[PDB]
């Protein structure tokens, strides 16, 4: 038999490892482990880009298998467009909440 005696992650994981384990249980990704899936990227359905500040760098892979990534600062305010493909992105700032 197993006499047990080995702790589990549920019992002993701490710090950022624990925060990642508990957010993954709720299907949430505060530490950006997963690639976000694109919307249609129109003015009416822009890609929603979370941030803990008022700006965030976006890289846009305009077409599948493009080797060139298009990089730009997305600012809080009106949706901005990728300078290569015109796809729409909108910042959604938020306090670093629990």
């Amino acid at each position: 038999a197993s006499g047990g005696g080995v702790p589990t992650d549920e019992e002993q994981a701490t710090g950022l490892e624990r925060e990642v384990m508990l957010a993954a249980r709720k299907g949430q990704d505060p530490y950006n482990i997963l690639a976000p899936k694109a919307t249609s990227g129109t003015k009416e359905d822009p890609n929603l880009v979370p941030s803990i500040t008022n700006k965030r760098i976006v890289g846009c892979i305009c077409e599948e298998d493009n080797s060139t990534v298009i990089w730009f600062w997305l600012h809080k305010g009106e949706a901005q467009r990728c300078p290569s493909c015109g796809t729409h992105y909108k910042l959604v700032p938020h306090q670093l909440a629990h």
């Binding site: 950006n32 482990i33 997963l34 690639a35 976000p36 899936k37 694109a38 890609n47 880009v49 979370p50 941030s51 803990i52 500040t53 965030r56 760098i57 976006v58 890289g59 846009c60 892979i61 305009c62 077409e63 599948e64 298998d65 493009n66 080797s67 060139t68 990534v69 298009i70 990089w71 730009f72 600062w73 997305l74 300078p83 290569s84 992105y89």
Partner: protein, 514 residues
């Protein structure tokens, strides 16, 4: 705070800075050694009156330029600065191990100094072949100090290689595949794989040399059934990958510089350029015995090494042609960095083609251990690596410093250097064809004219180097702060400003999957 920041660093940018400083200092040592070489040869007869000292100078020149100038600047300096910025990573995978790779180099350099200062130095050539490097022809501490210098440099670069591979594989944005990383990041990844596989074989070989010298082993000593040629196989099994290690990060930088100053969003034929660097890395492991065509090699072996060596020209040509295809249709900015890159393309090509001449074992019988080989590698390696470094340095100095160079001064520096290196090395082809041996302190009288001109060339490059130091001084003295950089949409390393904050990408980039 100073000690915590500069001695206890876990920051990729500050460690990159330490590498560039180290490499620049090492570059001055290597340069002084080169000028002593060309002073000994600058007129017929003896200058030093001591050919053991000449041989120590030649040996030290090579070790300093390869291990303390080129590799630290390209992999340590540009690698640490640029690779995390180009993939959106907050640091290297092993930020603390990163600091030990740096701090192993000053003691590595001290061991090599010590070797030159103790006894009569290590006058072996950078190949350190036994039995000349053995305990009868080189009794005393000098060769052992050289071996230990290489051990410390080997550990530095192996841990550096583990760090880069891990960083580039593990720390990209989750949507970015390897086929969305910039060519410079590929060039560092492939370089790191060659280091990981090649340096341990060098470490085994020189450890066997150390035991032959100190523990009465006879790996390389015929009296015990050993063989000097075994040493040569182990050395060059490392040594050929080493020459691709020295150029690959330069190929990466040249792809970025030509793309940038051509006003293009991307290099021509990205996947072709990835293929070419991987093909060069792979072929670089199966060609080593072209360094050994005169040791008494069977004809079938010579035929194989001739053929495998030549096919390296195919992937390399794809890169040269793709660089030209990148220029094609460009809005060309004639920046100093672009001049270094265009010089690189031409001079690398001349040196590559003399390589193809040497690959032919039948011609190599007559050209081996002559100044033709010296001409070959000062074109591909000395000019190629130095031109890529100077291009990189000029291009990215405002990113690292936050300050601009005077472009006019930078173009003057390029012109002087271009003249100096060509005057120095081009005539060495004539010396080689006409049969002047390498590793000579003096030459028959017929070789005087080309040696005189080559030594005059070396002084022109000296003037370029002194001018480079002043130009860096002028930038730090004037403090013209950078405002705006073009093409940030395809050059992520500039997007955090100049210089970037201590911590970048604390919040990662957003990249989705369409």
């Amino acid at each position: 705070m100073f000690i915590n920041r500069w001695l206890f660093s876990t920051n990729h940018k500050d460690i990159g800075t330490l590498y560039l400083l180290f490499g620049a200092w090492a570059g001055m040592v290597g340069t002084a050694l080169s000028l002593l070489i060309r002073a000994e040869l600058g007129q017929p007869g003896t200058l030093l009156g001591d050919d053991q000292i000449y041989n120590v100078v030649v040996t030290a020149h090579a070790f300093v330029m390869i291990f303390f100038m080129v590799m630290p600047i390209m992999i340590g300096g540009f690698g640490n600065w640029l690779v995390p910025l180009m993939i959106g990573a907050p640091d290297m995978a092993f930020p603390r191990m990163n600091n030990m790779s740096f701090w192993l180099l000053p003691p590595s350099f001290l061991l090599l100094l010590a070797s030159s200062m103790v006894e009569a130095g290590a006058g072996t050539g950078w190949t350190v072949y036994p039995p000349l490097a053995g305990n009868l022809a080189h009794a005393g501490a000098s060769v052992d100090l050289t071996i230990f210098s290489l051990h410390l440099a080997g550990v530095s670069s192996i841990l550096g290689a583990i760090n880069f591979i891990t960083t580039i594989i593990n720390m990209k944005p989750p949507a970015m595949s390897q086929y969305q990383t910039p060519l410079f990041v590929w060039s560092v990844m492939i370089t790191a794989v060659l280091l990981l596989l090649s340096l341990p074989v060098l470490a085994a070989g020189i450890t066997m040399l150390l035991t032959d010298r100190n523990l009465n082993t006879t790996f390389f000593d015929p009296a015990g059934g050993g063989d000097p040629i075994l040493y040569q196989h182990l050395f060059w099994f490392f040594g050929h990958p080493e020459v691709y290690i020295l150029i690959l990060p330069g190929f990466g930088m040249i792809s970025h510089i030509v793309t940038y100053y051509s006003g293009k969003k991307e290099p021509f034929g990205y996947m072709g350029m990835v293929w070419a660097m991987m093909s060069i890395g792979f072929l670089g492991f199966i060609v080593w015995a072209h360094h050994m065509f005169t040791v008494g090699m069977d004809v079938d072996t010579r035929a194989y090494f001739t053929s495998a060596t030549m096919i390296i020209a195919i992937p390399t040509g794809v890169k040269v042609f793709s660089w030209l295809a990148t220029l094609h249709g460009g809005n060309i900015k004639w920046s100093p960095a672009m001049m270094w890159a265009l010089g690189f393309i031409f001079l690398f090509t001349v040196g590559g083609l003399t390589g193809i001449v040497l690959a032919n074992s039948s011609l190599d019988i007559v050209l081996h251990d002559t100044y033709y080989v010296v001409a070959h590698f000062h074109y591909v390696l000395s000019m190629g690596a130095v031109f890529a470094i100077m291009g990189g340095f000029v291009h990215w100095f405002p990113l690292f410093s936050g300050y601009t160079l005077n472009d006019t001064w930078a173009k003057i520096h390029f012109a002087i250097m271009f003249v100096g290196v060509n005057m120095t090395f081009f005539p060495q082809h004539f010396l080689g064809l006409s049969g002047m041996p390498r590793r000579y302190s003096d030459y028959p009288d017929a070789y005087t004219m080309w040696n005189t001109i080559s030594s005059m060339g070396s002084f022109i490059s000296l003037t370029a180097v002194m001018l480079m130091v002043f130009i860096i001084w002028e930038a730090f003295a004037s403090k013209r702060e950078v405002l705006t950089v073009d093409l940030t949409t395809t050059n992520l390393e500039w997007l955090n400003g100049c210089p970037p904050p201590y911590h970048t990408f604390e919040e990662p980039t957003y990249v989705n999957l369409k």
